[PDB]
Write a protein that binds this ligand. Structure first.
Ligand SMILES: *[C@@H]1O[C@H](CO)[C@@H](O)[C@H](O)[C@H]1NC(C)=O
Ligand SMILES: *[C@@H]1O[C@H](CO)[C@@H](O)[C@H](O)[C@H]1NC(C)=O
Ligand SMILES: *[C@@H]1O[C@H](CO)[C@@H](O)[C@H](O)[C@H]1NC(C)=O
Ligand SMILES: *[C@@H]1O[C@H](CO)[C@@H](O)[C@H](O)[C@H]1NC(C)=O
Ligand SMILES: *[C@@H]1O[C@H](CO)[C@@H](O)[C@H](O)[C@H]1NC(C)=O
Ligand SMILES: *[C@@H]1O[C@H](CO)[C@@H](O)[C@H](O)[C@H]1NC(C)=O
Ligand SMILES: *[C@@H]1O[C@H](CO)[C@@H](O)[C@H](O)[C@H]1NC(C)=O
Ligand SMILES: *[C@@H]1O[C@H](CO)[C@@H](O)[C@H](O)[C@H]1NC(C)=O
Ligand SMILES: *[C@@H]1O[C@H](CO)[C@@H](O)[C@H](O)[C@H]1NC(C)=O
Ligand SMILES: *[C@@H]1O[C@H](CO)[C@@H](O)[C@H](O)[C@H]1NC(C)=O
Ligand SMILES: *[C@@H]1O[C@H](CO)[C@@H](O)[C@H](O)[C@H]1NC(C)=O
Ligand SMILES: *[C@@H]1O[C@H](CO)[C@@H](O)[C@H](O)[C@H]1NC(C)=O
Ligand SMILES: *[C@@H]1O[C@H](CO)[C@@H](O)[C@H](O)[C@H]1NC(C)=O
Ligand SMILES: *[C@@H]1O[C@H](CO)[C@@H](O)[C@H](O)[C@H]1NC(C)=O
Ligand SMILES: *[C@@H]1O[C@H](CO)[C@@H](O)[C@H](O)[C@H]1NC(C)=O
Ligand SMILES: *[C@@H]1O[C@H](CO)[C@@H](O)[C@H](O)[C@H]1NC(C)=O
Ligand SMILES: *[C@@H]1O[C@H](CO)[C@@H](O)[C@H](O)[C@H]1NC(C)=O
Ligand SMILES: *[C@@H]1O[C@H](CO)[C@@H](O)[C@H](O)[C@H]1NC(C)=O
Ligand SMILES: *[C@@H]1O[C@H](CO)[C@@H](O)[C@H](O)[C@H]1NC(C)=O
Ligand SMILES: *[C@@H]1O[C@H](CO)[C@@H](O)[C@H](O)[C@H]1NC(C)=O
Ligand SMILES: *[C@@H]1O[C@H](CO)[C@@H](O)[C@H](O)[C@H]1NC(C)=O
Ligand SMILES: *[C@@H]1O[C@H](CO)[C@@H](O)[C@H](O)[C@H]1NC(C)=O
Ligand SMILES: *[C@@H]1O[C@H](CO)[C@@H](O)[C@H](O)[C@H]1NC(C)=O
Ligand SMILES: *[C@@H]1O[C@H](CO)[C@@H](O)[C@H](O)[C@H]1NC(C)=O
Ligand SMILES: *[C@@H]1O[C@H](CO)[C@@H](O)[C@H](O)[C@H]1NC(C)=O
Ligand SMILES: *[C@@H]1O[C@H](CO)[C@@H](O)[C@H](O)[C@H]1NC(C)=O
Ligand SMILES: *[C@@H]1O[C@H](CO)[C@@H](O)[C@H](O)[C@H]1NC(C)=O
Lengths: 107, 125, 132, 452, 132, 41, 132, 125, 48, 48
């Protein structure tokens, strides 16, 4: 299966500063990569589906880009509400595995 | 757009459970449904996946063969009947729905990605 | 493109949306216009009335320059006496029902310039100026 | 590798479906002014050159026992027979008491107690006056109620008969059932087709051949013959309650006649309604009979037994017995010879035994006028008499056989004539046809996209 | 008058052949599809269904971009869930009847993609292209 | 005071209590609207 | 372009008129071609016949390259064996009814000449190099 | 094509008058009807006018409110009511109609500007 | 026909007093020549 | 829910719709016997 390798598990940044995330891949994923947010005690919801386009209700700070193997997630303004765990999961092969998990804590 | 899933409980290994996810609001017959479990260390592990048109089912390599999945479109219910349990399967399970709303410019968000609240499955001896 | 499903809009789904957003659902409402003895004559006249209405719509569409055409541009100029309001108030600020209520008086006039002053003139020019 | 969906219109794709089928007939039997019970002047004129198109490498499955064409045909037959009687006289004042004497008059050789000379009180044009008229009814048409015995008709307890229209003719003419444009009728051209299973030779004819709506029980009359051998077609050959339809390689000629010279007399039973009754038979009175050639029928039964050894047992003896019992449509052989309804005994034909190691067979018939057709208790039709000597020549092109319970497994197979169900009559000619709907739309991937 | 002799295959004659050979006889099964008391009701009920089935076929051919074309090229990619055979096992080893019994569940996902996601986009893209 | 007595008689009032929320409309798919777009020669 | 009405020509309004002048009434004659127990089945039959007669005028026109076209060019020569004059004596001094009254026999052999030398001759030339 | 008129006469100021324009030949339903009066010093000046489809009546800047224009497509007549008169209205009134024959290439002259015989009205004390 | 009716007053009824009528009448049989003499119970709202 | 056309006018009916269904049982405390009296050819008259 297409294994997913993510960023280091902590990138705790003080709010008001731009945070940059990424997650790698084994072989080519093309344009089918999404991102999720799981708050503690809440079910996860999507942010950037098809690796470029925002979802409904998501603010302008959440932006993602990338193609092929390496993909980037860009958070323009960090908020204390935006605490959660970051995941990316491929959608070009069949098993659909998820990311390792990146937890950002509020400073 | 609310998924009232139930089931779970405390069972010895080797038993069987039936997680029933009840679907309301969204079009159930047109949605591609999967099963994602979450435990400590295993961040959102995939379990199963079923289609919307046709009855083709896809399972993960670790849980292939032991587990079965089914749905009734007239009942809006999704079942993951667990069988031959192992202690590493102790996780909270999310009823996941995925569909692209194909008039894709009238819908500015042509992606559902609505997931259930989550029921906890605890297996131990 | 592997875990996705398929959910469509539905018939008359964008009736409350604006015409700029309900101009891209025309294929959804263009399907249910055809849908394929004691009291078997209400089921037999209903299957001829729909055929007659669909054929009347197709022939009215084809006597213009729009054959098999959902969004068809014509160079018939828009008159200011039919609707005084301009763009960005029609496509972003009204639905199709309000525009239909506004334009229902002048629809015979608009059909007359799309027939007479356009098609039988553009086709006469095609066989004259061009194609000798 | 970059596969785009493409639309193909007009692909050879069909699925099985049930749809309404209109009528078609030859113009020679369509322009005539003589009206038929089976309305044919409203049918489409047929194609002078039909298109019979053979399909190579098409293996389609036909099922003659779940064939919707037979049910649609049976509905059309019942509808036509219902609407052809609405214009004729309602014989509801015929239900009176009858003073009948046996016709032991001037021959009475073997027609001992069949013809009855019945005199009854009848109304006339004036409603306060009554007339005393007489008619000659059959024994099958009257029943006693408790010399000049008191009688009544057999129908007056069950229904009220409608007299058949005297100008229409109950003559079966060919009817071509044709499918609407956009549909098709497949045709199994296989010669070894038993009625079910895959057929390797399928042909998409525009519509069927001429199917004559012949009314018959226990002897399938003139129609389509088998091409090579005597064919046995059954829904379940290991079942004792399934009828055994048989086709014939060669037709067996049967001659049926009525030696009586009947006379029709008009009895005016109201203002514009006339009851055409039997008058007096002049000349000789004899029993109506059908003769089947004994040399042809023995060879035909020998071909039936020989092809029946494959289905049941190759050393098992085959014995033909007469009918068991029941109503007269099931017990005896009924048909329609010129408007006169016969009910002929078949004990002469089905009386033989067959070990595995030039005359005529006269069948004594029994003519009945008040009949209960299509087994509908509540509707009856009075056949008016036809004057003069009638004679029919017909082809026995098949049989309807019913097998009894197998005694001691496979020791002896007793076959008796059955019938009764009229869907088995249309199944002998609509077995090779089935109706499919055609979907010409088809999507298939290629490497070509639309040039924008 | 060069070239003498005339033999046609007949209607539906390429049904046993593969799709690569039955896609070359699409004119024969298209020209013959319409060609222009009881038995007065069934004749009436048959030539209503004969027109309805033709017009449902032509409407679903005119709402996609294939108004009057026998072979029509579109813009939707062929997703791998519908068939995994790489062209050869389709056009040279399979007839059209087996293709109908294979893609029978996906006759509504494909049709909706032909209509809404692409044809309703293509007319709007042509609208914005001819706007300026 | 307001004295109320039961009615009946008109049988259509029984089915007005079931058909009050439904109504039938005809649908006109043809529509004209101004844009800046004109067709070619 | 303000303060003036719009009165349209009635049905068959250019029946007696020259063919060049009557070539600008094609939309007039083509719009009113569809018109939107006892005494119920005969007009149902008439409506079905009017629909099926509206077709075969769009199916004879549609098999040629003139579907959706009011004035269609055809690559078929006009031989002088038919009733032929100069174009000044046909399109300027002669009505359409008189033109139909002269060629009443040759119109059937023209339709056989438009399905043979227009299509299935140029169609085979297109089929020589069909798909690129 | 004859636009015959009637009504009117000599009336003191403040009186009420109605002018009837019975039409013939031309199609009254698709004709844009006007009312233009011809006076000494100011000849052939516009007064009123009504549309062919709709019941929108456009009036002049000076005489707005003092005249009421109406049409009836059944009796094929055109009306103009003359209330609250002023002594500058002594003029002959012409009933005229305008329409564009739309074939336009079939009609050599597509201008249907029909006029009528005027009726003279005068107002004085 | 001319129904000859009497009050029932059978069993003990209940004071259904004058509601049911025991009507006897001459009705035609299947044969037109003969007649029957049958009886039937009719409600008071049906008979006049 | 109370529905009426012109509820200020007394000549218009008032269609009241209920929220909870009032159950009603209705019965006939009589064991009638259907008796078939044949009145013609194929006709019957079922009487009490
Ligand atoms: C279509 O659906 C049926 C039943 O749902 C299934 O048996 C069949 O395999 C499906 N077709 C394909 C190509 O998967
Ligand atoms: C497209 O193909 C993938 C791979 O089989 C499948 O999982 C997905 O559901 C398909 N989507 C559609 C809309 O057919
Ligand atoms: C054109 O539309 C805009 C709406 O954005 C409006 O503000 C403007 O006044 C309009 N112009 C005219 C001349 O109507
Ligand atoms: C039928 O199959 C054979 C063998 O593949 C082939 O030669 C023949 O052309 C096919 N027949 C048709 C329908 O063309
Ligand atoms: C039948 O009886 C009548 C008298 O009732 C008689 O005139 C007639 O000859 C008889 N016919 C026969 C065949 O006996
Ligand atoms: C006919 O009626 C008369 C009396 O009107 C009677 O004398 C005669 O016997 C009847 N004939 C029958 C019943 O055949
Ligand atoms: C009919 O023949 C087919 C073979 O073509 C066979 O499979 C089937 O069992 C037969 N049925 C009977 C009733 O003999
Ligand atoms: C009976 O069969 C013979 C062939 O032996 C045929 O010539 C004749 O026409 C048939 N008669 C019918 C079908 O009435
Ligand atoms: C035929 O009859 C046998 C025995 O009566 C029965 O077992 C079988 O199910 C029947 N049907 C078939 C073979 O389709
Ligand atoms: C039937 O009659 C024909 C001539 O009418 C004769 O040739 C044939 O042999 C007869 N058949 C029988 C079985 O009597
Ligand atoms: C003729 O029939 C008899 C029985 O009636 C039978 O024994 C004999 O074998 C038959 N003849 C032939 C040639 O089959
Ligand atoms: C029946 O036996 C005969 C031998 O006389 C043989 O020719 C025939 O093939 C057998 N049929 C079977 C076994 O089905
Ligand atoms: C059948 O033949 C037997 C003679 O064995 C006879 O007793 C019986 O009545 C006959 N039945 C019929 C219906 O002809
Ligand atoms: C038929 O013939 C048999 C024997 O010849 C006889 O017993 C029977 O009564 C006859 N009639 C019927 C209706 O079976
Ligand atoms: C069968 O025929 C034989 C001789 O022809 C006869 O003795 C026997 O009674 C007949 N049986 C039946 C049931 O007709
Ligand atoms: C039958 O009777 C009629 C008169 O009713 C006569 O003309 C005819 O010749 C008779 N036919 C025979 C065969 O006796
Ligand atoms: C796809 O199938 C074709 C069949 O001709 C084959 O040539 C090709 O190698 C296949 N592609 C893959 C990736 O297996
Ligand atoms: C626009 O409408 C006015 C009506 O106020 C009319 O006079 C004018 O002729 C129309 N424009 C065109 C081009 O017809
Ligand atoms: C009738 O003929 C005259 C010839 O001058 C022509 O002007 C007129 O247009 C023709 N009729 C019409 C109204 O087409
Ligand atoms: C014109 O007519 C002549 C004789 O009728 C014929 O020979 C010629 O082929 C025709 N022209 C065409 C193009 O068919
Ligand atoms: C027809 O008229 C044109 C005038 O432009 C002329 O050039 C041509 O030669 C004429 N043809 C004949 C056959 O007279
Ligand atoms: C058409 O045919 C008729 C009758 O044969 C003939 O009189 C007429 O002249 C023909 N038309 C022409 C243009 O020759
Ligand atoms: C449309 O016409 C009606 C009746 O003539 C009129 O009341 C309405 O104001 C008109 N609407 C418009 C927008 O012109
Ligand atoms: C009605 O009266 C008849 C006598 O005419 C009697 O036989 C019957 O029992 C009575 N019925 C009741 C219910 O008393
Ligand atoms: C029935 O008829 C008889 C005479 O037959 C008569 O006495 C009696 O009154 C009749 N019954 C009625 C009229 O209810
Ligand atoms: C029904 O409700 C609407 C909106 O609440 C109101 O305008 C109307 O007057 C009401 N009608 C009645 C009869 O109460
Ligand atoms: C309702 O009734 C009142 C008087 O009962 C009446 O004045 C009014 O016009 C009616 N209609 C309404 C309110 O629509």
């Amino acid at each position: 299966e297409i294994v997913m390798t993510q960023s280091p598990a902590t990138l705790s940044v003080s709010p008001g500063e731009r945070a940059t995330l990424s997650c790698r891949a084994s072989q080519s994923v093309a344009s089918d990569l999404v991102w999720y947010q799981q708050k503690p005690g809440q079910p996860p919801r999507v942010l950037i589906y098809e690796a470029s386009k925002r979802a409904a209700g998501c603010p302008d700070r959440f932006s993602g880009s990338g193609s092929g193997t390496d993909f980037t997630l860009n958070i323009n303004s960090l908020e204390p509400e935006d605490v959660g765990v970051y995941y990316c999961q491929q959608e070009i092969d069949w098993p659909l595995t998820f990311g390792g998990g990146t937890t950002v804590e509020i400073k | 757009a609310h998924l009232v899933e139930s089931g779970g409980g405390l069972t010895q290994p080797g038993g069987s459970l039936r997680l029933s996810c009840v679907v309301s609001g969204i079009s159930f017959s047109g949605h591609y449904m999967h099963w994602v479990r979450l435990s400590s260390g295993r961040g959102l592990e995939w379990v199963s996946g079923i289609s919307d048109i046709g009855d083709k089912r896809w399972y993960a390599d670790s849980v292939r063969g032991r587990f079965t999945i089914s749905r009734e479109n007239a009942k809006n219910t999704l079942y993951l009947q667990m069988d031959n349990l192992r202690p590493e399967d102790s996780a909270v399970y999310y009823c996941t729905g995925r569909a692209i709303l194909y008039p894709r410019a009238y819908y500015k968000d042509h992606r559902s990605d609505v997931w259930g609240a989550g029921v906890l499955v605890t297996v131990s001896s | 493109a592997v875990g996705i499903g398929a959910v469509f809009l539905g018939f008359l789904g964008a009736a409350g949306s604006t015409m700029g957003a309900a101009s891209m659902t025309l294929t959804v409402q263009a399907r249910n216009l055809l849908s394929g003895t004691v009291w078997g004559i209400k089921q037999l006249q209903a299957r001829v009335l729909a055929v007659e209405r669909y054929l009347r719509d197709q022939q009215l569409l084809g006597i213009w320059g729009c054959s098999g055409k959902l969004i068809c541009c014509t160079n018939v100029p828009w008159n200011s006496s039919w609707s005084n309001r301009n763009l960005s108030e029609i496509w972003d600020n009204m639905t199709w029902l309000q525009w239909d209520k506004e334009i229902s008086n002048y629809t015979q006039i608009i059909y007359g310039l799309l027939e007479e002053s356009q098609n039988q003139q553009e086709k006469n020019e095609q066989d004259l100026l061009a194609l000798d | 590798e970059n596969l785009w969906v493409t639309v193909y219109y007009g692909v050879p794709v069909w699925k099985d479906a049930e749809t309404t089928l209109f009528c078609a007939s030859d113009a020679k039997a369509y322009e005539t002014e003589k009206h038929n019970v089976w309305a044919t002047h409203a049918c489409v004129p047929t194609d002078p050159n039909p298109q019979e198109i053979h399909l190579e490498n098409v293996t389609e499955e036909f099922n003659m026992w779940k064939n919707n064409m037979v049910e649609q045909m049976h509905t059309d037959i019942i509808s036509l027979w219902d609407q052809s009687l609405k214009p004729c006289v309602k014989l509801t004042p015929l239900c009176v008491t009858l003073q009948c004497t046996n016709v032991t008059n001037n021959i009475t050789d073997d027609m001992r107690g069949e013809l009855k000379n019945c005199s009854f009180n009848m109304t006339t044009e004036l409603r306060d006056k009554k007339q005393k008229v007489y008619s000659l009814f059959y024994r099958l048409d009257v029943v006693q109620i408790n010399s000049n015995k008191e009688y009544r008709l057999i129908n007056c307890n069950t229904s009220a008969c409608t007299q058949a229209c005297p100008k229409v003719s109950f003559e079966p003419i060919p009817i071509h059932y044709c499918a609407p444009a956009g549909f098709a009728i497949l045709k199994c051209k296989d010669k070894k087709f038993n009625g079910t299973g895959p057929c390797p030779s399928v042909s998409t004819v525009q519509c069927t051949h001429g199917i004559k709506p012949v009314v018959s029980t226990q002897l399938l009359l003139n129609g389509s013959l088998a091409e090579e051998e005597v064919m046995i077609r059954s829904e379940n050959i290991t079942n004792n309650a399934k009828n055994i339809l048989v086709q014939f390689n060669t037709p067996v000629q049967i001659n049926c006649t009525r030696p009586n010279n009947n006379t029709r007399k008009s009895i005016r039973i109201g203002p514009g309604q006339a009851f055409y009754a039997t008058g007096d038979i002049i000349g000789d009175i004899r029993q109506a009979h059908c003769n089947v050639s004994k040399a042809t029928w023995n060879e035909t039964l020998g071909k039936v037994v020989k092809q029946l050894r494959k289905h049941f047992g190759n050393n098992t003896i085959i014995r033909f017995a007469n009918s068991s019992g029941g109503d007269l449509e099931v017990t005896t052989h009924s048909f329609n010879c010129g408007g006169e309804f016969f009910y002929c005994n078949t004990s002469g034909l089905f009386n033989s035994t067959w070990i595995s190691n030039n005359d005529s067979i006269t069948l004594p018939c029994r003519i009945k006028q008040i009949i209960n057709m299509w087994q509908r208790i509540g509707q009856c039709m009075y056949a008016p008499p036809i004057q003069g000597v009638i004679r029919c020549v017909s082809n026995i092109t098949g049989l309807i056989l019913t097998r009894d319970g197998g005694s001691t497994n496979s020791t002896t197979e007793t076959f008796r004539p059955g019938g009764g169900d009229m869907r088995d009559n249309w199944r002998s000619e609509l077995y090779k046809y089935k109706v499919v709907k055609i979907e010409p739309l088809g999507v298939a991937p290629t490497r070509c996209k639309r040039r924008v």
